[PDB]
Design an enzyme around this catalytic site. Sequence first.
Site, short mmCIF file in Angstrom:
data_model
loop_
_atom_site.label_atom_id
_atom_site.label_comp_id
_atom_site.label_asym_id
_atom_site.label_seq_id
_atom_site.Cartn_x
_atom_site.Cartn_y
_atom_site.Cartn_z
N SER A 192 -59.30 -48.00 -80.22
CA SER A 192 -57.98 -47.55 -79.81
C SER A 192 -57.83 -46.09 -80.23
CB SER A 192 -56.88 -48.41 -80.43
OG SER A 192 -55.60 -47.90 -80.12
N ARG A 193 -57.52 -45.22 -79.29
CA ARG A 193 -57.47 -43.80 -79.61
C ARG A 193 -56.17 -43.39 -80.26
NH1 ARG A 193 -60.41 -40.53 -75.51
NH2 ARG A 193 -62.04 -41.84 -74.57
N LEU A 194 -55.15 -44.23 -80.20
CA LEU A 194 -53.91 -43.91 -80.90
C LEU A 194 -54.06 -44.11 -82.40
CD1 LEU A 194 -51.23 -42.87 -79.77
CD2 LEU A 194 -52.78 -43.78 -78.03
N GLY A 234 -58.53 -45.77 -74.78
CA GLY A 234 -59.32 -46.76 -75.49
C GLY A 234 -59.56 -47.98 -74.63
#
Lengths: 43, 498, 98, 98, 528, 132, 48
Positions: free
Chosen positions: E343-345, E319
């Site tokens: 944010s990819r989390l 991200g």
Amino acid sequence: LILKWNRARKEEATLQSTLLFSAFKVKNQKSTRDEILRLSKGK
Amino acid sequence: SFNPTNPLKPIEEKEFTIFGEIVEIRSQVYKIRIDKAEEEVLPKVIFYADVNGKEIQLEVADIFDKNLVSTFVLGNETGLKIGTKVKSKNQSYAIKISKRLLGRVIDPIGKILDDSIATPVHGNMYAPLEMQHDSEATRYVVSPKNAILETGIKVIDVLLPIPKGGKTGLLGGAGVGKTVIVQELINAFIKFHDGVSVFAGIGERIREGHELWKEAEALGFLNKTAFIFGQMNESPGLRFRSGISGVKVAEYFRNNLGKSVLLFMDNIFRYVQAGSEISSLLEKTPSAVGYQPTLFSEMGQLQERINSTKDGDITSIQAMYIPADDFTDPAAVAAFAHFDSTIILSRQLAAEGVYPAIDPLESNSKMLSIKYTSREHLDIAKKTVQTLEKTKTLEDIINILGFDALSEDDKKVVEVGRRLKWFLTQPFVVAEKFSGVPGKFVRLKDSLKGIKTILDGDLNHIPVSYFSFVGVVEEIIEKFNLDAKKEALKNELEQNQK
Amino acid sequence: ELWKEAEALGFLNKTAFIFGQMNESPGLRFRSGISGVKVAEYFRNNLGKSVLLFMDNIFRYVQAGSEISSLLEKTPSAVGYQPTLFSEMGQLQERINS
Amino acid sequence: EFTIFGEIVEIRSQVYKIRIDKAEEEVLPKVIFYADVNGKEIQLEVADIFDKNLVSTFVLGNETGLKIGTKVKSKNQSYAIKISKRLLGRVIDPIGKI
Amino acid sequence: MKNLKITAIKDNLIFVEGEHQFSFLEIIKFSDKVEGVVLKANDRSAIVAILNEDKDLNLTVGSLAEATGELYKIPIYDNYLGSIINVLGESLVKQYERTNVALDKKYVFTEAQPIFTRSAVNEPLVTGITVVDGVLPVGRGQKELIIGDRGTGKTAIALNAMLAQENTDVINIFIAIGKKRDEIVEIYGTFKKHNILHKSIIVSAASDDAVAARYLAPYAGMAIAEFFQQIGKDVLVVMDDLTNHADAYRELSLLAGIAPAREAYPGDIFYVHSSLLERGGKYGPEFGGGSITILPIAQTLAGDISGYIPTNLISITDGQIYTSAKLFNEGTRPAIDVNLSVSRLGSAAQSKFMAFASSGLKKIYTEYKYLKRLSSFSSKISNRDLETLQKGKAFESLIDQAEYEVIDYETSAILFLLLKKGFLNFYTEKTEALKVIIGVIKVFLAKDVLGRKMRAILVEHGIDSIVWNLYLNHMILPLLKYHLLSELQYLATNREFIKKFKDIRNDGRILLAYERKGYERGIAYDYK
Amino acid sequence: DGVLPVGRGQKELIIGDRGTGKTAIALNAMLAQENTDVINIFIAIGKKRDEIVEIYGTFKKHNILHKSIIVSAASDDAVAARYLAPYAGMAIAEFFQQIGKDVLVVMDDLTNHADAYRELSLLAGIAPAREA
Amino acid sequence: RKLSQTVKERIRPDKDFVITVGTNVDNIARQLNLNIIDHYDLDLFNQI
Ligand SMILES: Nc1ncnc2c1ncn2[C@@H]1O[C@H](COP(=O)(O)OP(=O)(O)OP(=O)(O)O)[C@@H](O)[C@H]1O
Ligand SMILES: Nc1ncnc2c1ncn2[C@@H]1O[C@H](COP(=O)(O)OP(=O)(O)OP(=O)(O)O)[C@@H](O)[C@H]1O
Ligand SMILES: Nc1ncnc2c1ncn2[C@@H]1O[C@H](COP(=O)(O)OP(=O)(O)OP(=O)(O)O)[C@@H](O)[C@H]1O
Ligand SMILES: [Mg+2]
Ligand SMILES: [Mg+2]
Ligand SMILES: [Mg+2]
């Protein structure tokens, strides 16, 4: 739009010309090295 | 039982017959001079070296003389010096293949990647680079595509059908949603597939590979899947061979066991990038945009082995990376020639919130033919794409000249186009972590019915906002009806109060 | 014109001028800023004064550096510029400190 | 004292190659070689050191008068200018010419 | 003993002669301090890139050198913490004395640990910024790129993220590639002021330092971080910035004779950055059991996010955070463009209460932008679109936050909860009043013992508990009701206002008390 | 046929983007010769094998197979083979023409042929020109 | 906003009655709590 096109085309053309000359300057390394040797020896 | 007609043959037993030492060094590229040899060295053979008990393999690229060769490393180079001793069997690299590979995570050269104790994988030694067949004509006995896979994704199922036994590609820039779509396709295809699956990670994230391995363990399809991982932390020599090893494993599972293989490759651009880096390190004259001269041949050498014969089908789903969002890149142009279905992702659509960010005005599919689908599906797809194109044209007029310049037809066209564009968005099952909206699976006939209803103009009264991220159109109708009912009840209550 | 105006307006007696102009070879144009920085450093360190260094044109420093790099047969970067562009800019600008 | 002596063995626009004949020390990067021609001195700044003897330079100033065989000498130091409080009110170029 | 001799010095590279068994990045010692690294080598010659300089050495042709026979390893010393060091381990500015016994020696190009050594990201990294902690979460072991234009506040975001670790166990490392020395000294002073110096290191490679030093600085910093992680500590690494690192690598490659590629960068710049950044993450207990969180910084040109290096870096990190020059020009700090960031989390990198508080706000903000940029024929707006517009405008007022200001995680969670439940929509006409009420709520939650009790019980009993509901209903909501009545009287008759603020007393003594306290240092006649 | 006429002996390029229907136009041109005396030669340069097999099947279905030749150089054939494929196809066409026949030749496609020649020249050591 | 100023100036909620067409002026009147006799739709103004 005119501004962006001019900038982009200038960048691309310069990169293409440099990359084309890279081959020519690579192919003539031995002559440069021999000239450097014979100039270093010299008189 | 099953009788193989073109089975793979394990490598020939041999003794080390070529011996030499490293006379020039560099980053990833080393020159070897041969001292002793009972035979002449061949292209693409492997020289093995040992440093403190660690084995390092070097693939041969050029043969300058009878004794001098150039090589590149397959793995880490830490330990190689001037004078390191190397020995060779005059054979290319080989890996252990068998039915025991399913559920195991390895790298292109066969190093174990799922446990620290390095539990060995039993099988026979096969050389992925060496492909053997009776003659060239044998390569032309291939089956025709005659089926279409159902994915559950409205836009892909309607406008860009995916072949069975063919090749589909997912192209897009950085961070547009290629990996999410690949994972959704894995979820929607495996566990229902009459065969096996092979995943090949090529220059991708370590975290993504770990996540996918854990998901495979959790959802129970790990034992039906073979994982190969040469990721972005690896040397160019390893990223160059991940696809070859994956294709070799798929060919073993198809030719030798008569199984249908689902082959996933991600990312297929990194193979070309690694080949370009290797070519640049060997000091060869670059092509345009500084690529290797053998780009198209290198792409073909990998893509032509993914074929479908009478033994089984190999269905390939591949993710392609577009550098700097430049779709005229030579790698993209080389890859375009092999994809039966092409799905192009847009950054602007993703910015607007459209997910999946598929651009139907830039994509194409060769499965949209009378040979594979019905007349109604073709008509619906063509009408949808035509309406989207007309809407895109009219949006510029709206943006510049305002809205009142349009006619009644143009306004209705824009309304239908907006509703169509926002109906194609859909929440993915794998994408529940990002937001929390539960995933939806829409079959082909429901998608066709919904698109036909929207095209007819039946739902022009419902505001556009309701159409985003639903399943069937019945969900839109239900949400609209409940909201209207709540509004009516509130109005009646306030008028009773006054 | 600037020199005449400095003399006429009366601040010439407290100003030192280093002029490597566009009529000069690339070496002088490339060394003008370094010489000015050295003069300002001498004025601050040896005479205990506060110095207002003034450079015009600072783009010509980069242009002269790129010309010198081209004359020495080096592979250009970006828009035909020298590979050591930001390094040269840092070399010039890091010595203007407090 | 002037410790390094040599000649010019290659000429070009702004770039000159110098072969060193007598030196009591090894040449350092960026040092200045002086050539006296027709009563005027010309300064060449070292760029590349190909060998113990051969070296390449680019001219700091006007290059008219330089030719093959011109004798050059160097103190193995970089270019230097005169700085004092009498520099205020004066106009000089980077190398100190009035 | 010396076994090599310098034969040429060209293109800022040193050519040495002498029979030896060279290796890549082998250290060549020219004196007791000056060292270089072997780049290419024959069996009797080598090409070396210097790492540092000495005034008195006078390194020229004929100078003697020694091939140490070992790789470029950085040594670890006890006094690294609270100091600025170069790539070789020399203290440019130090706080404590050094004992000359090396704790460890870490290889600069250590390969990243394989797949089986990793672990899922499940613990937050508090950056001290509300919008980052709530909508763009950063976990321990996650690589979040900070992409932006020139002068938009990226370094400030990284510095805030590191200053938020004053009361935690996370060790900060700041790698500076081609920065200004007077800015590194200022960052050192900022670290000293906020009492995070004892747990912070700075690795510096100035803009006019050796190209090899600028190229190898991030790897040395990562080796230090790996040393700290091998004893199970959480490390937060900030690389400022990878544009300078890419420029240094391009300069070294082009001076070394390599052919150019897209944008004149060498063909393997992606491999450089990916092999650099793949050494950070969360690790299992059997392999150190720590984490290395990286926040690289990169610069765009005129907001062009589709550049070669920005997109190369986006494909590596998990991200990005985008800072807008248009937002910065309007005085909006931080100038974070949430619509272009991600944010990819996701919620997997948040606490349960924080995850619940901001469940679907980013999507709502994207929808709000889409409706704001949309032109339609019917000027009638449905109730859902009105709610979306109001909630987006309310969300826009939570981004603003002063420089070097650390906001607690629970304060951000409470503010996002208030936004989500719909209490902040009524401020859609007055935004200064919203800013005042947010400031008052933050002060109450930070200073009052009841605010800290509210945050503590939010942490231990959760949002759904009865105690936290009582605290919200008796402490925070009455203040909002009083402020809304004061600023907008007509809300006394609004239907939704009556529906929500039904069993809430109109108590506003907290705001009045704080206003009195602030104005108590007030004077009738000014002196200036 | 009506607006953009093609005569016997005229070389007519088909130029366009990917997936627009160029191969389909050429295949229609070859299929229209079912009831005529024209001989069809299809040259594939760097094309996929499955597409060539499908084209052969389309030839068989429409009863134009008995007077059609396909000269195939797939995408993973030797680069010299891909460079020489169109010349061999035209040599076969000239063999048929020398005995008085009418021949229709389709080259699909010459961009791959130029790419193959460029690869050969760069590998050999020929100096690059515009676009390498 | 100029119309809002004018209405707040020269209208009283006791001795004056306000007819609002369109969402914006309806909201303005409701905020001023004026005597809204009836409300219409803006399209009604399209046809005289
Ligand atoms: N939240 C904030 N509130 C107020 N001022 C701020 C804030 N964040 C940053 N600034 C200020 O804005 C200016 C620019 O920020 P900063 O220098 O961190 O940006 P940058 O992207 O690193 O810039 P550069 O391109 O110069 O490296 C500085 O003066 C900084 O103090
Ligand atoms: N279907 C989706 N639903 C919701 N969010 C999505 C979806 N697809 C993508 N995203 C968003 O886009 C981000 C990037 O997705 P993804 O990891 O698939 O990108 P990518 O194209 O593989 O990127 P890279 O170039 O780094 O490999 C995700 O983290 C998520 O925030
Ligand atoms: N007359 C037609 N009517 C309907 N569909 C057609 C027609 N002609 C071509 N198509 C379709 O267009 C698509 C492209 O076909 P074709 O193979 O001719 O394309 P192309 O331009 O050669 O593409 P490529 O770049 O892949 O070689 C196919 O799906 C085909 O079915
Ligand atoms: Mg991806
Ligand atoms: Mg900064
Ligand atoms: Mg075609």
